[PDB]
Write an enzyme that holds these catalytic residues in place. Structure first.
Site, PDB file in Angstrom:
ATOM      1  N   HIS A 205       0.826  -1.201   0.000  1.00 49.35           N
ATOM      2  CA  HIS A 205       0.000   0.000   0.000  1.00 49.35           C
ATOM      3  C   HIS A 205       0.860   1.249   0.000  1.00 49.35           C
ATOM      4  O   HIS A 205       0.828   2.045  -0.943  1.00 49.35           O
ATOM      5  CB  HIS A 205      -0.917   0.004   1.219  1.00 49.35           C
ATOM      6  CG  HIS A 205      -1.862   1.160   1.243  1.00 49.35           C
ATOM      7  ND1 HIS A 205      -3.155   1.073   0.775  1.00 49.35           N
ATOM      8  CD2 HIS A 205      -1.688   2.445   1.633  1.00 49.35           C
ATOM      9  CE1 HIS A 205      -3.743   2.245   0.902  1.00 49.35           C
ATOM     10  NE2 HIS A 205      -2.873   3.092   1.417  1.00 49.35           N
ATOM     11  N   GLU A 206       1.652   1.427   1.056  1.00 51.69           N
ATOM     12  CA  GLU A 206       2.385   2.679   1.221  1.00 51.69           C
ATOM     13  C   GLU A 206       3.451   2.862   0.141  1.00 51.69           C
ATOM     14  O   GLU A 206       3.593   3.957  -0.414  1.00 51.69           O
ATOM     15  CB  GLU A 206       3.000   2.731   2.618  1.00 51.69           C
ATOM     16  CG  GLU A 206       2.039   3.109   3.764  1.00 51.69           C
ATOM     17  CD  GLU A 206       1.191   4.358   3.497  1.00 51.69           C
ATOM     18  OE1 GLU A 206       1.642   5.285   2.798  1.00 51.69           O
ATOM     19  OE2 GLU A 206       0.051   4.416   3.998  1.00 51.69           O
TER      20      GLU A 206
ATOM     21  N   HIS B  48       2.220   4.368  -3.165  1.00 55.97           N
ATOM     22  CA  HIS B  48       2.106   5.821  -3.231  1.00 55.97           C
ATOM     23  C   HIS B  48       3.341   6.442  -3.863  1.00 55.97           C
ATOM     24  O   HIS B  48       3.257   7.517  -4.456  1.00 55.97           O
ATOM     25  CB  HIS B  48       1.891   6.394  -1.839  1.00 55.97           C
ATOM     26  CG  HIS B  48       0.499   6.231  -1.338  1.00 55.97           C
ATOM     27  ND1 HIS B  48      -0.592   6.730  -2.013  1.00 55.97           N
ATOM     28  CD2 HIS B  48       0.018   5.647  -0.218  1.00 55.97           C
ATOM     29  CE1 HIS B  48      -1.688   6.450  -1.333  1.00 55.97           C
ATOM     30  NE2 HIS B  48      -1.344   5.804  -0.239  1.00 55.97           N
TER      31      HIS B  48
ATOM     32  N   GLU C  61      -5.581   6.431  -3.384  1.00 56.91           N
ATOM     33  CA  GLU C  61      -5.797   5.506  -2.273  1.00 56.91           C
ATOM     34  C   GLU C  61      -6.166   4.104  -2.769  1.00 56.91           C
ATOM     35  O   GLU C  61      -5.656   3.103  -2.253  1.00 56.91           O
ATOM     36  CB  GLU C  61      -6.884   6.065  -1.340  1.00 56.91           C
ATOM     37  CG  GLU C  61      -6.348   6.627  -0.017  1.00 56.91           C
ATOM     38  CD  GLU C  61      -5.201   5.788   0.548  1.00 56.91           C
ATOM     39  OE1 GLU C  61      -4.045   6.226   0.487  1.00 56.91           O
ATOM     40  OE2 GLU C  61      -5.448   4.681   1.048  1.00 56.91           O
TER      41      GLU C  61
ATOM     42  N   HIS D 118      -9.774   7.805   1.835  1.00 55.86           N
ATOM     43  CA  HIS D 118      -9.908   6.432   2.326  1.00 55.86           C
ATOM     44  C   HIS D 118     -11.335   5.897   2.265  1.00 55.86           C
ATOM     45  O   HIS D 118     -11.555   4.757   2.694  1.00 55.86           O
ATOM     46  CB  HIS D 118      -9.389   6.329   3.761  1.00 55.86           C
ATOM     47  CG  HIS D 118      -7.960   6.743   3.909  1.00 55.86           C
ATOM     48  ND1 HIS D 118      -7.586   7.934   4.496  1.00 55.86           N
ATOM     49  CD2 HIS D 118      -6.813   6.150   3.502  1.00 55.86           C
ATOM     50  CE1 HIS D 118      -6.268   8.041   4.471  1.00 55.86           C
ATOM     51  NE2 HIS D 118      -5.775   6.969   3.874  1.00 55.86           N
TER      52      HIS D 118
HETATM   53 ZN   LIG Z   1      -2.696   5.315   1.461  1.00 52.83          ZN
END
Ligand SMILES: [Zn+2]
Length: 328
Positions: free
Chosen positions: A165-166, A169, A189, A251
């Site tokens: 996930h991170e 980005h 997101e 989110h």
């Molecule tokens: Zn995120």
């Protein structure tokens, strides 16, 4: 004279259980300086850094003794495979592995680099672990990955899902640039939640279709941050594009494309790798920073054309999330 070496150690937490690298999961790629018999939680593609509950560091790699090629050594400072904290066996083992899976799924499956430099050279994935005191977050800061050890609600936040996930980005700002607000912010997101699934798929061949269940304390009431098969299960995320309103936090507007992705990869003769291939390419070549949900559907269809996927599987799916692609 740091050379290749194979790291053996444990991972996981009290909830999802504890597993051994070099048995349940692949060996870790470490480096070793024989002349001092010191080892390093670092390879070409991934550096793991132990913040030791500090908030600032110099990102020198985590460094552990490995005194006495199929030879392997045990990780951790006491060379026993552990770096235990707050219910996790060794979040630093889990970052090194997470950094691997993510680096490989992007490079092997899609031929692209999860992280590149300004000039185009690949950028090494720095994993900063044990950050802060009882920190219940993990975040991307343009240059590196920071994971808290959690507190009362969550275990330490190193997992394939969170890491994918991170990290992704980073993939989005160096490509599509999906702005972190509005519709594009939901798409941003969302992309990270897809990459979270793709990392679990590279690893074990099936995926949660949830987000964070593995880090939520089993006696914390909550079982998962998000559900991608039906986001609105969480009480606030939206399932279709028509439910948008400008005041959604990203989110919770992420539900749209998260639903889309679940719907696409569950289509006949589709799997996760195919559906994420479309998204990696749309993010790579067509998505705009100010993209609306409808413009994203165009980027996807244009990408699938470039890769040869079935366009009518794409459309039915877009149509199910009430996105319309008429004007592309
Ligand atoms: Zn995120």
């Amino acid at each position: 004279e740091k050379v290749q070496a194979k790291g053996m150690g444990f991972g996981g937490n009290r909830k999802i259980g504890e597993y051994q690298f070099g048995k349940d999961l692949p060996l870790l790629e470490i480096t070793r300086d024989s002349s001092v018999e010191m080892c390093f939680m670092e390879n070409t593609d991934v550096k793991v850094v132990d913040m030791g509950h500090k908030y600032y560091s110099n990102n020198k790699p985590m460094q552990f003794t490995c005194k006495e090629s199929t030879k392997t050594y045990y990780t951790g400072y006491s060379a026993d495979g552990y770096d235990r904290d707050n219910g996790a066996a060794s979040p630093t083992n889990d970052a090194l592995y997470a950094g691997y899976v993510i680096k490989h799924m992007y490079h092997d499956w899609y031929g692209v680099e999860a992280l590149t430099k300004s000039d185009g050279s690949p950028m090494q994935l720095v994993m900063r672990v044990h950050y802060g005191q009882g920190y219940e977050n993990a975040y991307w800061d343009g240059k590196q990955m920071t994971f808290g050890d959690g507190d009362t609600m969550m275990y330490p936040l190193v997992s394939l899902g969170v890491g994918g996930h991170e990290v992704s980005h980073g993939f989005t700002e160096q490509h599509s640039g999906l702005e972190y607000f509005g519709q594009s912010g939901g798409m941003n997101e969302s992309f990270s939640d897809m990459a979270a699934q793709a990392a679990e798929y590279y690893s074990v061949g099936k995926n949660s279709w949830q987000i964070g269940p593995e880090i939520m304390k089993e006696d914390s009431g909550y079982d998962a941050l998000r559900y991608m098969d039906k986001p609105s299960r969480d009480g606030m995320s939206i399932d279709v594009a028509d439910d948008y309103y400008g005041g959604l936090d990203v989110h919770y507007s992420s539900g749209v494309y998260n639903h889309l992705f679940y719907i696409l990869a569950n289509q006949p003769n589709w799997n996760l790798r195919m559906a994420f291939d479309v998204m990696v390419k749309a993010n790579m070549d067509y998505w705009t920073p100010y993209s609306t949900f409808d413009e994203g559907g165009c980027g996807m269809l244009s990408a699938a054309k470039d890769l040869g996927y079935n366009l009518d599987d794409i459309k039915k799916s877009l149509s199910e999330v009430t996105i319309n692609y008429q004007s592309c």
